[model samples]
Target: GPLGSMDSPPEGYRRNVGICLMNNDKKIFAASRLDIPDAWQMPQGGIDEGEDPRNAAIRELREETGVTSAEVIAEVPYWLTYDFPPKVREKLNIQWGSDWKGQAQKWFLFKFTGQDQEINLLGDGSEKPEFGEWSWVTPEQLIDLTVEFKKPVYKEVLSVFAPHL
Candidate 1:
């Protein structure tokens, strides 16, 4: 580990997978957090060590919602990464090496084959509240609804998925 020190990331950053679920009708799946006020996010989370990104994506989908499987419509070849906000980074520096490492992510697009009502955020045996409500929204609505800090990401997602739509 010391051989690559300083020159690269310290290798403790959270690896994540983001799945943008789109139904056959071209509607994108969006969900509202359970406790967090007005926070909406795609199904995404850390990829455990030794787990393949595709498997992690599937696991995250199952954990975040009830989705166990779906037809993968597409996958982005390149990844998108951003740094943590400075204040949060500084605060987490003590616990995490490299205050602003990155989220190594595998982005996936899936087409829902089952009923929308079956998609429950609390489906898995997770204690944490992931989402309380979910709906299929237009890409345009997603761009407007996402938090300002994450607008750029939503925009990029929109741009990427537009061609498919």
Candidate 2:
């Protein structure tokens, strides 16, 4: 039997921040999910209450990649929104309120100043790791490796930040 969907948007779209962390060589950082099948993506997470979007992007960068020395180079002029597939939204109902359709994300481009050895997928052990592995790749490579539903968002971000790459 169907449990039925929520009547209205839960708490509104989740406010989130996403990062496109690049190195001097113009490679972006991508992480492999420990939980999803074939889901590799750039560092991103939800923004906390009263937090600045830029600060939230950097915080997510550090939390997911464990890299600290980074500087913002550019940011998308508008927030990008995406919806989770229906099955995913249903799955999330168990842990999250059912009203969030997906995410409204503010994206930033960052230049990584630290060495390669500094990237740690496990983070500092303060929270469970989202990524099981990590890699540095070109925008093209990142697009090819990311989940299908997220490809349009990635392409838009990559195109806007093309000059910096």
Candidate 3:
């Protein structure tokens, strides 16, 4: 009764995946949220039940960043957890119709295989595009770019993916 299965995240948490896409030159892909200017971070999203992480990352990358040419390079085998700060928690309650402690995420690193011209924030039109602008940023730069809530996760992700970068 204590341990949950794959169908759902741990209690009070949302199941999600975070994508850290890197170009050949070692620059990481970063973007700004449409609703929050200057809040830059890697593309990420929710994973469906029965969905594999690779495909989940690919599809989310397309929808959020319009990047379909990403190649999986590394995966953080364990889930990382974070609780939403009060303001964002309230905002999400209105949007998600429930309270959540935070999110439990699967972090993935992908290499970008396409040219710069291929990036389109409007993406594949699978959902409303989430980014207002996009660019390639150094790994260290992304920590500064991300929101305060996500900074620690960004730091850990970059460290693990550093070897491949």
The candidate that wins on lDDT is: 2
Q: Rank the candidates by lDDT, best first.
A: 2, 3, 1
lDDT per residue (tens digit) for residues 19-108 in model 3: 889998788898888788778889888778878766787788777777878788897666665655568767763456665556677778
Deviation from native of the Cα of residue 90 in model 1, angstroms? 1.1
- For residue 23, give model 1's deviation from the true position in Å: 1.2
Model 2 C-alpha lDDT per residue in residues 1-165, reported as the tens digit of each score: 111122222356667778999888798887788887477789887789879778999998887777889899998767765755568767754336655566677789999887878777785566687788778888878888887766677777888798877
Q: What's model 2's TM-score?
A: 0.79
> TM-score of predicted model 3?
0.79
How many clashes show up per model? Answer: 0, 1, 0
Q: Which stretches of candidate 1 lie over 4 Å from their true place?
A: 1-12, 123-126
| Weakest ten-residue segment in model 3 by summed lDDT | 1-10
List per-prediction Cα lDDT, in the order shown.
0.65, 0.76, 0.75
Clashing pairs in 2: 10-99
Q: How accurate is candidate 1 locally (lDDT)?
A: 0.65
Q: Once superposed on the true structure, which residue ranges of model 2 sit more than 4 Å away at CA?
A: 1-11, 35-37, 85-100, 124-127
